[PDB]
Amino acid sequence: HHVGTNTGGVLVITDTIIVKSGQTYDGKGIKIIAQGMGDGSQSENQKPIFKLEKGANLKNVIIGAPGCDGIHCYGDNVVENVVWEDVGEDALTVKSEGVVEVIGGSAKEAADAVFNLNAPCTFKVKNFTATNIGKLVRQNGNTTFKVVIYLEDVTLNNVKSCVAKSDSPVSELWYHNLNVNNCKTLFEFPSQSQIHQY
Numbered sequence: 001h002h003v004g005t006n007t008g009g010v011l012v013i014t015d016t017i018i019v020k021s022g023q024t025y026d027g028k029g030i031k032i033i034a035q036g037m038g039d040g041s042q043s044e045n046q047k048p049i050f051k052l053e054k055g056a057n058l059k060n061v062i063i064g065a066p067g068c069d070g071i072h073c074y075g076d077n078v079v080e081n082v083v084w085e086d087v088g089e090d091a092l093t094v095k096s097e098g099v100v101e102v103i104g105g106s107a108k109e110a111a112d113a114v115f116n117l118n119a120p121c122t123f124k125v126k127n128f129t130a131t132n133i134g135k136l137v138r139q140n141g142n143t144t145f146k147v148v149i150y151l152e153d154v155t156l157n158n159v160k161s162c163v164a165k166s167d168s169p170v171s172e173l174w175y176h177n178l179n180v181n182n183c184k185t186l187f188e189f190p191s192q193s194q195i196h197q198y
């Protein structure tokens, strides 16, 4: 474990960090605290900490409270070793179509959803821990476009609502090495046959 070279620093920001297409923002272990961008409550008018344009990547940051509106992903994004110390309204939202992968890192203290999927996408969560959350993944309510979710080597503890919820019959969830402790229900999809192991 080579600790990142910005470890121990705290970057205080006052606007959304925009990562452009083809860029990788590498925080090298920096912790970010946002000011004037929200309080991390359930209010829907907060700003995202990061906006990842299509084809942009993000790695090696710790997002401190307040989590605001977390990370907005416009598709074809890799989000690697990001730690949400205290999720805000939500941790990450898929805002436009593409593949989005969350690999490594962890999330704690999500009052509602950790990941909100608001456009058709392929959404993978890999080597990830979350504790004290309402839901790990929510396809935006009452939408019927298709998402495909993969949960691979995911460990969850204290899930108040469910692991994942969608109102879309054509969406699917696939999981592989999923460990869940203390959860109300695992999956709230129209039918349980939308959920698969692999």
Ligand SMILES: O=C(O)[C@H]1O[C@H](O[C@@H]2[C@H](O)[C@@H](O)[C@@H](O[C@@H]3[C@H](O)[C@@H](O)[C@@H](O)O[C@@H]3C(=O)O)O[C@@H]2C(=O)O)[C@H](O)[C@@H](O)[C@H]1O
Residues within 6 Å of the ligand: 044, 089, 090, 093, 112, 116, 118, 138, 139, 140, 141, 142, 165
């Ligand atoms: O991208 C967003 O932040 C998203 O937030 C709202 O929607 C989510 C979710 O997609 C909705 O189904 C709805 O969730 C239900 C309740 O309102 C919520 O408080 C909780 O009890 O879970 C419910 C459920 O999962 O069905 O509201 C969610 C929310 O409050 O964050 C916005 O409505 C949506 O437009 C978008 O901004």
Ligand SMILES: [Ca+2]
Residues within 6 Å of the ligand: 042, 089, 112, 113
């Ligand atoms: Ca909410």
Ligand SMILES: [Ca+2]
Residues within 6 Å of the ligand: 044, 089, 090
């Ligand atoms: Ca919301």
Ligand SMILES: [Ca+2]
Residues within 6 Å of the ligand: 069, 089, 090, 093, 116
């Ligand atoms: Ca949100």
Ligand SMILES: [Ca+2]
Residues within 6 Å of the ligand: 040, 086, 087, 088, 108, 109, 110, 111
């Ligand atoms: Ca929180």
